Design a protein around this ligand. Sequence first.
Ligand SMILES: CC(=O)N[C@H]1/C(=N/O)O[C@H](CO)[C@@H](O)[C@@H]1O
Length: 421
Amino acid sequence: GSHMEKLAKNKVISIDAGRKYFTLNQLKRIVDKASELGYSDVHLLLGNDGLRFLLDDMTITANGKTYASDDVKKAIIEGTKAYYDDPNGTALTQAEVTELIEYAKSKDIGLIPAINSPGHMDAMLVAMEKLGIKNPQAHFDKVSKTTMDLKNEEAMNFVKALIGKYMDFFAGKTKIFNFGTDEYANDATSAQGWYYLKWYQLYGKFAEYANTLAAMAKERGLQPMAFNDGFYYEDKDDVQFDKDVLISYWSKGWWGYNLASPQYLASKGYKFLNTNGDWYYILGQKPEDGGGFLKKAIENTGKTPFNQLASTKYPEVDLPTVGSMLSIWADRPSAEYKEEEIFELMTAFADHNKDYFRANYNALREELAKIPTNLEGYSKESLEALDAAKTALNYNLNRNKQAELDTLVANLKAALQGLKP
Ligand SMILES: CC(=O)N[C@H]1/C(=N/O)O[C@H](CO)[C@@H](O)[C@@H]1O
């Protein structure tokens, strides 16, 4: 409602760097563009099908043994390559992600990492086989290639420990950690995972897994995030979930795929990051394919309100959100990533919501850096003018006031150009 509240909401661009590889530089250009358009965060899937992030030390202790760091890396590379051997690269390094966090911090952009499980973990599944964990995959109408078997303790201990090490790295570097939990063995159930889980009475074990991951996150000072799919499926509460989880809500599903309504989750106390399916772009999707092609995503940045949760009509239904997230996915990871399409889409979201997005502070930052470090040998006339310009700076401006901001920075330049001994 207020100027302050709107700017305090999260405005997030999501990048699926799990299915598909992105260079440090491509990610830095995304954060750049995120900063310029007044976003607050970049949500970066690192484990999503492919596992595209390796820590310097990947030693894992589970199952009463330890798996050598070198073995863990080699296995993961193999797992990720088997999902998709991307010719542009395999995994980002620790040094790369650390630099991306520092860089994003310098531009007032948070990073929100995601490592997906128990679904979307093709690469982890293969890696576990290579490390001597047999049959880690869930098994329904056929053996899953995507999802871990909830009954396999050996696989479960390994993954939990692996997610731990990832969370240890992000602790004190990022505020939020997304553990995902979307799509339970959809490839093995004709996209009816949750129905299969309830049918087999494994849904309770699903919640246990999810609740464990939320507690792990919290223990290490990370806000846990997850997608909506798995929580209180079909609005039933026979099986309980951690209430502290930030729910990234993208859709209520479709016929026979009966996700909890956002009304039901709100009534359970959840906060949402509005990740509306309407805003999805899948790299390379064409009009003729239906779903999230670029021109529909761009049109929806106007048509679907900022605060509208999927399946609800806003403002008739008005549920509290912490902010909204626009998502770029790489379902066919060999599709070409075309920066400008993403930029055009980010820009369109920001342009239709100028009251939510910050102005562009990059020019201001450039100018503040041109301030001399000592500045003790200049006149008092020169410095009074620089004091007054520095004081008149406004960091609270939204995207409707670029001009108002540019003037302020112009005066800072003039005062800096105005100094003299
Ligand atoms: C949370 C989520 O969105 N999960 C999948 C998805 N579910 O509808 O659609 C996207 C685009 O097809 C996929 O890339 C996602 O991995």
